[model samples]
Target: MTVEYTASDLATYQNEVNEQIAKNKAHLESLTHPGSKVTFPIDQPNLKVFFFDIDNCLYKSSTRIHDLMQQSILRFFQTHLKLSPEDAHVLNNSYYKEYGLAIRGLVMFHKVNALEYNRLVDDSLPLQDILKPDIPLRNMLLRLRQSGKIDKLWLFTNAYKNHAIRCLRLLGIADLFDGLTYCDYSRTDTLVCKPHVKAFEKAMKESGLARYENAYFIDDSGKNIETGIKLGMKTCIHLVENEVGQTPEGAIVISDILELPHVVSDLF
Candidate 1:
């Protein structure tokens, strides 16, 4: 089912979103010089960070594996949340709708055990049997090495650290990212996850940014883009054909990964 955002939440970042539009406007005007490229990544006092979604963004998720994951999530709710099967399904989607990740919602309102949550929701998913490395996506990541200007690449996912690393290695880009911010089961009681401003801020801190600086991010989910935009990045939302209401208005929208080079060719 397609998930749509409520009207109120889309307007949550209004003031900050307006300021970013103005910033991008001035920044774009300055790039009008012939052959000019974006200077955000290579500039001093700034860190070139790239954040990406892992599952659908990295490789196409097979319907079979995705169905298995949904089953696992539903079963977890039945067992732990102590709901009937029908109720479990309803609650699962409900939490997913409220918080970008159901795990975050569970932590917030239910005081859920995150390690158990990952073991049930992520670890049990049959990824090896379903998803595999995509040669095209793998090639794009390898190109990052030559991109020179991108100082760091990062994964901001709802999955645990183990699965996050596992997926990257399987895709043959294990060494590409500088670091990862996975669901920290050790501190899961706090509900830190993407689309949470604190979580994004913590990523910046972990990446050691003393001052706010230019960064970049791409995600299939606008919620992630909203958080990245809040953290002040040149954000892009990967959508099917619709860019409307994705990220803040005026944010860059790239429908294809191959189109990315054109967006940041100046950085190289």
Candidate 2:
């Protein structure tokens, strides 16, 4: 969150980012090798790691939290970025497609305050009013955990920590996750979101995930899942309800989250 908004400053931020990413890559090798303490059994070279994206993927999208979140984005576009309500929605989506996140491009184009956007867009959602105890999803997570096939369960989210935490807790499945990797919006200068190779790498490194090949990715976003596929993750599940453009070829499409266990019974 540096105040100096210059091209030089942006370059410095990216330089710092790449330096850490290099270290993260080095750290991954060290972690996977025989040097580090063992988290998984010795026999399994590719441990069955599960990565779940929160928000629309975990809970039912029928709740319209996604829709409300979209509305919030449009509001931010309108009030902060100054566009008409209709133009706001369209531009927000345009940013989404081009930059992978609405705020990402906003930072480059409008120099929108990242923290301000994070606060308004996330806090505006009444998760308390929207989310409920997802017994089925929780039970499914429990089942996966007990199956002895899953090495670890990580919640990988594009949202900031507060929003992700509130949603998970309100859904009554907070305890099911082994780790959480969220968008650290506090550092606007070095902010990264999903579908970015750098962001995905950051998520894996923070989760202590040494090998992407061992991890299973589940997300509602086709773009995010495509990145996972490119990362060489296992069982890339695209949780899309509609029969629309079914993602980037390799993803295993699942209409419902509950269908996961029986759908991939071979893994268990």
Candidate 3:
């Protein structure tokens, strides 16, 4: 079955696309010139803590680390769990669908060792070969830090602590973050990951953020953004290489990390 669009509909869609492009250009201009009229939203000026997700959120999805990680995860399930190739594939995706992380489901249903899964899947990845230092990313972090409005900047990631630290060092922004709130793989039975209420609650507690309203979070997952918004934190979806101009309710969208400086200029 195929659907057809009328000329008027096409024109309307094109107009919407043009409008978003113009808005993005304006935002870039605002950042390019410090005194230019800042156009991005700044609803919460009192945001004190900034929580950033690692992995694809920190870097571009074009880096292919996401793909590598998925491959590694599937391989881990196949080899470590002693499942046939077909079953491994099915369970791997099923776990990700049921829980945000495949390991979460593995621990709960299959009784797999979470820490060993992390070691084999995440820690064993050849991140050094795939990732390189991102100077622009580093500069962005520095700008946010030097802004002085945010008292603390912490990493909020579903990846285990080891993988989080590895990516931070690889990107050369390890020093910029005050602390890390990563998945505790040791607790396989009760693992909490993003898009889950417990994970956000734990992040808030560990980051010492007393007021949820005074917090901001950015991640690549729309589910995570929804959870953050529900938790009273201003959310930004890092839609890298994904759809453009998608402004979810109570969340802002950015196609690139560079737009962050402009979007949250009020914080800076």
Candidate 2 regions off by >4 Å? 1-46, 70-78, 81-87, 91-100
Give the alpha carbon lDDT tens digit for every residue of 85-184 in model 3: 6645655444322223655765777656777655555555566666567788888888998887898888888877766766676666777877788777
**Candidate 3 regions with alpha-carbon error over 4 angstroms:** 1-47, 81-87, 90-100, 238-240, 244-247
Task: Tell how far residue 203 is off in model 2, in angstroms.
Answer: 1.7
For all candidates in order, the CA lDDT equals 0.57, 0.67, 0.66
lDDT minimum window of 10 residues, candidate 3: 35-44
lDDT, candidate 2, 54-163, per-residue tens: 86677766436556567767545534434446645664444322222655665545456667665555554555566767778778888888888888888887777766
- Record all residue pairs in model 2 with backbone atoms less than 3 Å apart, i.e. clashing: none
Q: Model 2 scores what on Cα lDDT?
A: 0.67
RMSD of each: 16.0, 11.7, 16.2
TM-score of each: 0.70, 0.73, 0.73
lDDT (10s digit) by residue, model 1, range 29-54: 44332222221221025667777667
Q: Which candidate, 1 or 2, has the higher TM-score? A: 2
